[PDB]
UniProtKB/Swiss-Prot annotation, chain A:
It comes from Enterobacteria phage f1. Belongs to the inovirus G6P protein family. It comes from the Viruses. Interacts with G3P; this interaction is required for proper integration of G3P and G6P into the virion. It is a multi-pass membrane protein. Its main location: virion. GO terms for biological process: symbiont entry into host cell. Keywords: Host membrane, Membrane, Transmembrane, Transmembrane helix, Viral penetration into host cytoplasm, Viral penetration into host cytoplasm via pilus retraction, Virion, Virus entry into host cell. It is found in: Virion; Host membrane. The chain holds residues 1 to 56 of 112 of the full protein. This is Head virion protein G6P.
Swiss-Prot record, chain B:
Interacts with G6P; this interaction is required for proper integration of G3P and G6P into the virion. Interacts with G8P. Interacts with the tip of the host pilus. Interacts (via N-terminus) with host TolA. Interacts (via transmembrane domain) with host TolQ (via 2nd and 3rd transmembrane domains); this interaction allows the phage translocation across the host inner membrane. Interacts (via transmembrane domain) with host TolR (via transmembrane domain); this interaction allows the phage translocation across the host inner membrane. The gene is III. Plays essential roles both in the penetration of the viral genome into the bacterial host via pilus retraction and in the extrusion process. During the initial step of infection, G3P mediates adsorption of the phage to its primary receptor, the tip of host F-pilus. Attachment of the phage causes pilus retraction bringing the viral particle into close proximity of the host cell inner membrane. The chain holds residues 275 to 323 of 424 of the full protein. It comes from Enterobacteria phage f1. This is Attachment protein G3P. Belongs to the inovirus G3P protein family. Consists of 3 domains (N1/D1, N2/D2, and CT) separated by glycine-rich repeats and a C-terminal transmembrane segment. The N2 domain interacts with the F pilus, whereas the N1 domain forms a complex with the C-terminal domain of TolA at later stages of the infection process. The C-terminal domain is required for release of viral particles from the host bacterial membrane and proper integration of G3P and G6P proteins in the virion.
Length: 56, 49
């Protein structure tokens, strides 16, 4: 299906930006699931900590 | 006796490519459908922890 000389490269580029940008969203998602790991850890560590004082 | 309609069909052939619609549409998906399986996998693995 005949096309001009530059259209096939505009169509390949408009799906490079999309995969790059959808690649960044993934990186940031994974980071925010690491915050909920730090948070949980902290809480349970403060509980185990108080126990050791009171029983002493 | 310039063949008006032979020069035209010779300007075209030199300033035109060839493109398969259903091949530029299968690659695009192919690459965006690999990043969507890692976004799902992530979500699924947080609700199982």
């Amino acid at each position: 299906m005949p096309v001009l000389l530059g259209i096939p490269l505009l169509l390949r580029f408009l799906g490079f930006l999309l995969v790059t940008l959808f690649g960044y969203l993934l990186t940031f998602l994974k980071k925010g699931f690491g915050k909920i790991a730090i948070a949980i850890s902290l809480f349970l560590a403060l509980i185990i900590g108080l126990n050791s004082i009171l029983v002493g | 006796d310039f063949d008006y309609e032979k020069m035209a069909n010779a300007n075209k052939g030199a300033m035109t490519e060839n493109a398969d619609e259903n091949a530029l549409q299968s690659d695009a998906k192919g690459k965006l459908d690999s990043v969507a399986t890692d976004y799902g996998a992530a979500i699924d693995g947080f609700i199982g922890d």
